[PDB]
Symmetry: C3
Subunit: 77 residues, 3 copies
């Protein structure tokens, strides 16, 4: 009914292409840390499977680690 | 009875002033990533509305995106 | 039965040694932000007490702040 926080660690050489395909599927993600790049992206419940699948197609093999975390509340100001 | 993790994405030109006013209201936040600056701040349940309001007054219009996330446990060592 | 996300803020002069001893106890952590270094580390329920204890022995006194957060789902690709 509501949101999840995705936290993803992936290979930097997939950072470019993953980021590109997030954009194409209307996912708004933030680049957090590299060496391995960490992204976090707020996603609707409906669309977790969707973003998992995108991360999967563009990353891993390559490597990828993903956390789906609960969100109590979301505000845009 | 307990805590929340706030995760906030805001405009970098509001980073300076938001950070200042967090301090004034005894909020301890960490600067995480910029381009848009990401902050996270551990807050007590009681005080979520408070920190939302601060983020709101000093950021957005400007833009701001905020996640309130559950915390199982908190330790200071 | 499942996982937690640990989020830890500690002193940078303990960053070196904490990181070393995480590795020795098979904890996979990501370095996020410094000034104070922020780490996050995905941990199994079983092993929270374990990683708390490691953070504690190697950090704080020194200072350390730790969040244990719920994880709905975990995927490796
Ligand atoms: Cl990985
Ligand atoms: Cl924004
Ligand atoms: Cl600290």
């Amino acid at each position: 009914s509501h949101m999840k926080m995705i936290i993803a660690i992936v290979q930097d050489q997939d950072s470019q292409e993953l980021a590109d395909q997030l954009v194409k599927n209307n996912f708004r993600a933030t680049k957090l840390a590299t060496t391995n790049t960490t992204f976090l992206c707020g996603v609707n419940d409906d669309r977790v499977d969707e973003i998992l699948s995108v991360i999967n197609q563009t990353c891993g093999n390559g490597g990828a680690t993903v956390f789906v975390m609960p969100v109590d509340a979301f505000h845009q100001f």
